[PDB]
Design an enzyme around this catalytic site. Structure first.
Site, PDB file in Angstrom:
ATOM      1  N   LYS B 167     119.185  55.085  59.941  1.00 58.55           N
ATOM      2  CA  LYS B 167     117.486  56.540  59.931  1.00 58.55           C
ATOM      3  C   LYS B 167     116.076  55.962  59.194  1.00 58.55           C
ATOM      4  O   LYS B 167     115.169  56.768  59.578  1.00 58.55           O
ATOM      5  CB  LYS B 167     118.001  57.717  59.695  1.00 58.55           C
ATOM      6  CG  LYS B 167     117.326  59.104  59.978  1.00 58.55           C
ATOM      7  CD  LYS B 167     117.891  60.323  60.022  1.00 58.55           C
ATOM      8  CE  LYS B 167     117.442  61.357  59.393  1.00 58.55           C
ATOM      9  NZ  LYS B 167     118.400  62.466  59.993  1.00 58.55           N
ATOM     10  N   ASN B 191     112.917  56.221  68.055  1.00 60.59           N
ATOM     11  CA  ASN B 191     113.589  56.399  66.475  1.00 60.59           C
ATOM     12  C   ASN B 191     114.094  57.368  65.788  1.00 60.59           C
ATOM     13  O   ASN B 191     114.345  57.993  66.874  1.00 60.59           O
ATOM     14  CB  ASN B 191     112.184  55.760  65.344  1.00 60.59           C
ATOM     15  CG  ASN B 191     111.286  55.856  66.523  1.00 60.59           C
ATOM     16  OD1 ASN B 191     110.446  57.297  66.409  1.00 60.59           O
ATOM     17  ND2 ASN B 191     110.000  54.564  66.639  1.00 60.59           N
ATOM     18  N   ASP B 192     114.585  57.848  64.828  1.00 56.90           N
ATOM     19  CA  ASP B 192     115.328  58.646  63.885  1.00 56.90           C
ATOM     20  C   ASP B 192     114.578  60.284  64.383  1.00 56.90           C
ATOM     21  O   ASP B 192     113.190  59.713  64.246  1.00 56.90           O
ATOM     22  CB  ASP B 192     116.474  58.483  63.211  1.00 56.90           C
ATOM     23  CG  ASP B 192     117.575  59.913  63.467  1.00 56.90           C
ATOM     24  OD1 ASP B 192     117.387  60.662  63.680  1.00 56.90           O
ATOM     25  OD2 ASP B 192     118.804  59.244  62.761  1.00 56.90           O
ATOM     26  N   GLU B 193     115.029  61.319  63.936  1.00 51.05           N
ATOM     27  CA  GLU B 193     113.498  62.428  63.525  1.00 51.05           C
ATOM     28  C   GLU B 193     112.450  62.087  62.200  1.00 51.05           C
ATOM     29  O   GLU B 193     111.386  62.334  62.299  1.00 51.05           O
ATOM     30  CB  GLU B 193     114.350  63.730  63.583  1.00 51.05           C
ATOM     31  CG  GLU B 193     115.646  64.252  62.874  1.00 51.05           C
ATOM     32  CD  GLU B 193     116.567  63.409  62.655  1.00 51.05           C
ATOM     33  OE1 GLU B 193     116.285  62.809  62.122  1.00 51.05           O
ATOM     34  OE2 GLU B 193     117.845  64.382  62.780  1.00 51.05           O
ATOM     35  N   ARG B 287     115.377  69.031  69.695  1.00 52.80           N
ATOM     36  CA  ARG B 287     116.451  70.040  68.547  1.00 52.80           C
ATOM     37  C   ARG B 287     116.286  69.990  67.033  1.00 52.80           C
ATOM     38  O   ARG B 287     117.008  70.871  66.612  1.00 52.80           O
ATOM     39  CB  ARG B 287     116.745  70.454  69.161  1.00 52.80           C
ATOM     40  CG  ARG B 287     117.574  70.131  69.572  1.00 52.80           C
ATOM     41  CD  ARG B 287     119.205  71.413  70.066  1.00 52.80           C
ATOM     42  NE  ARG B 287     118.736  71.960  70.542  1.00 52.80           N
ATOM     43  CZ  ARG B 287     120.196  73.180  71.347  1.00 52.80           C
ATOM     44  NH1 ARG B 287     120.534  73.592  70.315  1.00 52.80           N
ATOM     45  NH2 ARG B 287     119.359  74.058  72.217  1.00 52.80           N
ATOM     46  N   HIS B 320     118.180  67.817  74.366  1.00 54.14           N
ATOM     47  CA  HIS B 320     119.214  67.131  73.441  1.00 54.14           C
ATOM     48  C   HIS B 320     119.703  68.260  73.667  1.00 54.14           C
ATOM     49  O   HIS B 320     120.556  69.577  72.839  1.00 54.14           O
ATOM     50  CB  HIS B 320     118.725  66.419  72.378  1.00 54.14           C
ATOM     51  CG  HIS B 320     118.058  65.455  72.258  1.00 54.14           C
ATOM     52  ND1 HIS B 320     118.083  64.700  70.341  1.00 54.14           N
ATOM     53  CD2 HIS B 320     116.959  65.353  72.695  1.00 54.14           C
ATOM     54  CE1 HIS B 320     117.402  63.411  70.828  1.00 54.14           C
ATOM     55  NE2 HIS B 320     116.915  64.251  72.588  1.00 54.14           N
ATOM     56  N   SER B 367     124.661  63.675  73.610  1.00 51.23           N
ATOM     57  CA  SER B 367     124.703  62.755  72.141  1.00 51.23           C
ATOM     58  C   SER B 367     125.992  62.684  72.060  1.00 51.23           C
ATOM     59  O   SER B 367     126.759  64.170  71.883  1.00 51.23           O
ATOM     60  CB  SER B 367     123.965  63.002  71.026  1.00 51.23           C
ATOM     61  OG  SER B 367     124.242  64.426  69.893  1.00 51.23           O
TER      62      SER B 367
HETATM   63  O1  LIG Z   1     120.930  61.519  64.871  1.00 49.93           O
HETATM   64  C1  LIG Z   1     122.177  61.905  65.234  1.00 49.93           C
HETATM   65  C2  LIG Z   1     124.283  60.963  64.806  1.00 49.93           C
HETATM   66  O2  LIG Z   1     123.763  60.425  66.529  1.00 49.93           O
HETATM   67  P1  LIG Z   1     125.083  60.394  67.232  1.00 49.93           P
HETATM   68  O3  LIG Z   1     125.647  62.263  67.271  1.00 49.93           O
HETATM   69  O4  LIG Z   1     125.037  59.963  68.843  1.00 49.93           O
HETATM   70  O5  LIG Z   1     125.765  59.735  66.459  1.00 49.93           O
HETATM   71  C3  LIG Z   1     121.682  62.607  66.607  1.00 49.93           C
HETATM   72  O6  LIG Z   1     120.419  62.035  68.025  1.00 49.93           O
HETATM   73  C4  LIG Z   1     120.906  63.957  66.236  1.00 49.93           C
HETATM   74  O7  LIG Z   1     121.320  64.575  64.877  1.00 49.93           O
HETATM   75  C5  LIG Z   1     121.810  64.820  67.259  1.00 49.93           C
HETATM   76  O8  LIG Z   1     121.236  64.931  68.531  1.00 49.93           O
HETATM   77  P2  LIG Z   1     121.773  65.983  69.919  1.00 49.93           P
HETATM   78  O9  LIG Z   1     120.521  67.437  70.556  1.00 49.93           O
HETATM   79  O10 LIG Z   1     122.075  65.387  71.417  1.00 49.93           O
HETATM   80  O11 LIG Z   1     122.748  67.419  69.561  1.00 49.93           O
HETATM   81 MG   LIG Z   2     118.821  61.302  65.482  1.00 50.12          MG
END
Ligand SMILES: O=C(COP(=O)(O)O)[C@H](O)[C@H](O)COP(=O)(O)O
Ligand SMILES: [Mg+2]
Ligand SMILES: O=C(COP(=O)(O)O)[C@H](O)[C@H](O)COP(=O)(O)O
Ligand SMILES: [Mg+2]
EC number: 4.1.1.39
Lengths: 458, 459
Positions: B167, B191-193, B287, B320, B367
């Site tokens: 991440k 990319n991650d958040e 979100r 999401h 996700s």
């Molecule tokens: O970092 C992650 C863990 O990934 P994963 O769930 O693929 O193992 C996710 O992208 C978000 O925290 C949740 O996104 P959402 O809004 O779809 O719940």
């Molecule tokens: Mg994420």
């Protein structure tokens, strides 16, 4: 599972602070039924730092350096403090400065809904020097407002305000003449959170008519007046077209307007528009549904402490505080420090002593139906009288209504500034002394057997 | 305050719905003890509308026809339902549009702290045709993404993607390098958040490299790759500047760049910037932190249903939505429920029915991951497959490495679509065949007798 990489309970708490590479955090988190404290702590550090879902090393070399570490825990009080490297933060490409968005994203993002954590409330952060100074901060505070009220910019005292009743319901003119009616006794008029451009009380036409009734009330009173114009938008260019409207319609009176942004329900970008674009103006941060997540009941998110402290950094000139409309009748606690954290340059938060290095106070905006009799005493405990006050009960409570309630309130401050005891000062200025006739049971215990002394009954 | 005037328990709901001058809201509100239910609801109705703390006035007397009503309660089930006239909602001095911020101060306001209410959570909102019509709307969705993948715009299917892991760490070549290599199976990376400019790995280079990597993968595969870049900043001008650096660096394949804004941790003005400055690109609304309200351990705020419905109105391209991710006795913030309100031009929520009048839609962004074999059973309970799957290579756990995973799971959707039972596809497509080998745990039970008909030897 999960690690022993994100924990180092040997790191000294003070050695960390002093080093200045990390932002520290202090949460109260209880893991869901079954999980370890430590494992749950490192998971949460892990979900706020680096990740790497399951398994191995990946490219490696430095991921394993910029790792957020849990440096201390108490299972019994449920105490996690986590130390986040300063390199993890995200700065503008525009001007290199911090962004609260990121501080929030990291420290209270996917943390608030995640794995083995069952409620986690952030209760205090610590910002180092290399990160504090990347922050914006308030541009202005009650000093530019004292400065418009022709007071001294250091210890100028109390601004007396109101919120026009009613909340919603007033056409432009009546609105504008109910603005007249209180500028005649007090100095500040707000605008309730929602007022803007309703069909039945449009922004363009209400703001023209208030601007006007500002000039007539300035004139009959000799005294300067202050108005807060709500310029809350979603579109950041309406936010600007509201503010630029309002300020050019106030003309010469522009310095007297404070910009109201309800930065809780529109976000750090409404607020960062207000500030950054209008840095001259007073950025009033009205809160709102801060209670979604800051109420004592909600065990997740952050406390009010943390809401106000972040605000100083974002760059809010003033922010609401004090919560009355009931609120005391059993002994309470520990959100007292909101005050010295908002205004002092070096203070003790609940876990960490913060140092703002010359970064401007943000002022307590006080609320409630605290009447001029309660006030003398509130200025003693806090210690000074440098806050904006917004009333309902003290103004509307007084028996001669509006202008008098307001007058009783500036009268309760002078008595306090000037060191003269309210009961005596009551004797001379009717308004104050009729404040005691106004709120009886509030009278008879703050100021016992007031009657005899004021000129009536026994 | 009061009761009276702010109550009209006798106003029938459908009469309120048929006409359209009122926004209807539903809450789960419990009074603090000693407090007396209808009175308290009236006192909630007043702290979210007209105020009227007694002898205060609209002098002529009576201008309370902008007064929010209580039209229904059920003391036992704690159901306070309220009517908000429409004149109250703030429009805009420049274009006429309503605003989610207003919407949000009139309902989600100062009722979130009020001293004579222990909690109140919004469950649904009805938002009529004169108010709903003033409101951004998505200006694009999954179908702008599909039209660049090379597919039809209607009933058009699954976009699969990842999250670069770790991440945060990885200086720039490694993160680029990790993109390319995922860009040989999958469609979409994000990319991650927490990603933008960390000093160690900066946006400027880290994005040029990503764009360089994009064209390597679209040489060697013949097909198109999508990138969802995080352009989240406190300052709109920063939001915009980041945002226009990306579409200019990616340049020739700038229509393949989805735009990510962290939507909770930065409010509505962050969302509103992208939405209007980049009308032309996917507005991904990811979100973060929603959990503080929505997560059901919290009784104050709005729920995940409400958070996704208004994000539609506002303008997210795709949000999401969650994951079906359940078991047994349903309700309690459904993946279907939401999905259906975000895509469907005339869905039903837990109380109200809403007619989006020709909006567009915000694609659910699913996700988790139900690898290869479980997938087509996702697509069944839904009733389509037009979402995006972002997965943690858990979904891409595969004997062959996560290159066969994204293809394995791409294969399971082609299969579903066309409709030839997964198994007959696996003889024909390897990573699916091998997608079974990776998952003996399902690929036996979930897809019947495969040993005999498929992929080899062992027990
Ligand atoms: O970092 C992650 C863990 O990934 P994963 O769930 O693929 O193992 C996710 O992208 C978000 O925290 C949740 O996104 P959402 O809004 O779809 O719940
Ligand atoms: Mg994420
Ligand atoms: O509605 C009011 C009225 O009471 P008052 O007469 O005191 O203005 C205020 O807008 C908030 O409730 C108090 O603000 P805060 O967020 O600081 O509690
Ligand atoms: Mg108010």
């Amino acid at each position: 599972d999960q690690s022993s990489r994100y924990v180092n309970l040997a790191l000294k708490e003070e050695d960390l602070i002093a080093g200045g590479e990390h932002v520290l955090c202090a949460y109260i988190m209880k893991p869901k039924a079954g999980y370890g404290y430590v494992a749950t702590a490192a998971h949460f550090a892990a979900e706020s730092s680096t990740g790497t879902n399951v398994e191995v090393c990946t490219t490696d070399d430095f991921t394993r350096g910029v790792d957020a570490l849990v440096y201390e825990v108490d299972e019994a009080r449920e105490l996690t403090k986590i130390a986040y490297p300063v390199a993890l933060f995200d700065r503008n490409i525009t001007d290199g400065k911090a962004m609260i968005a990121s501080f929030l994203t990291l420290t209270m993002g996917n943390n608030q809904g995640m794995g083995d954590v069952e409620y986690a409330k952030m209760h205090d952060f610590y910002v180092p020097e290399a990160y504090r100074a990347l922050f914006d901060g308030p541009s202005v505070n009650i000093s530019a407002l004292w400065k418009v009220l022709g007071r001294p910019e250091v210890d100028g005292g109390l601004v007396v305000g109101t919120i026009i009743k009613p909340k919603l319901g007033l056409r432009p003119k009546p609105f504008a003449e109910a603005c007249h009616a209180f500028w005649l006794g007090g100095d500040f008029i707000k605008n309730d959170e929602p007022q803007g451009n309703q069909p039945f009380a449009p922004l363009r036409d209400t703001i023209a008519l208030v601007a006007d009734a500002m000039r007539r009330a300035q004139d009959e009173t000799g005294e300067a007046k202050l108005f807060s114009a709500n310029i809350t938008a979603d579109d950041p260019f309406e936010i600007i077209a509201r503010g630029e409207y309002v300020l050019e319609t106030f003309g010469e009176n522009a310095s007297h307007v404070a910009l109201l942004v309800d930065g809780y329900v529109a976000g750090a970008a409404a607020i960062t528009t207000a500030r950054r674009r209008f840095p001259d103006n007073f950025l009033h941060y009205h809160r709102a549904g801060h209670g979604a997540v800051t109420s004592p009941q909600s065990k997740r998110g952050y406390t009010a402490f943390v809401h106000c402290k972040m605000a100083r950094l974002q760059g809010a000139s003033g922010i609401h505080t004090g919560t009355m409309g009931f609120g005391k009748m059993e002994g309470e606690s520990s959100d007292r420090a909101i005050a010295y954290m908002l205004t002092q340059d070096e203070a003790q938060g609940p876990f960490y002593r913060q140092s703002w290095g010359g970064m401007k106070a943000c002022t307590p905006i006080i609320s409630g139906g605290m009447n001029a009799l309660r006030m003398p005493g509130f200025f003693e405990n806090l210690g000074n009288a440098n806050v904006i006050l917004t009333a309902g009960g003290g103004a509307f409570g007084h028996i001669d209504g509006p202008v008098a309630g307001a007058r009783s309130l500036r009268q309760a401050w002078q008595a306090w500034r000037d060191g003269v005891p309210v009961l005596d000062y009551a004797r001379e200025h009717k308004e104050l002394a009729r404040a005691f006739e106004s709120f009886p049971g509030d009278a008879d215990q703050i100021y016992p057997g007031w009657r005899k002394a004021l000129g009536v009954e026994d």
